[PDB]
Amino acid sequence: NEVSERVHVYHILKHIKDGK
């Protein structure tokens, strides 16, 4: 499913790069 796969990959990069 296109919605399920893309939301998962966007949250991993947003939390590590912006948060640290």
Swiss-Prot record:
Location within or outside the cell: Secreted
Regions that span the bilayer: none
Domain of life: Eukaryota
Protein name: p18
Lineage, highest ranks first: Eukaryota, Sar, Alveolata, Apicomplexa, Aconoidasida
Gene from which this protein is expressed: SERA5
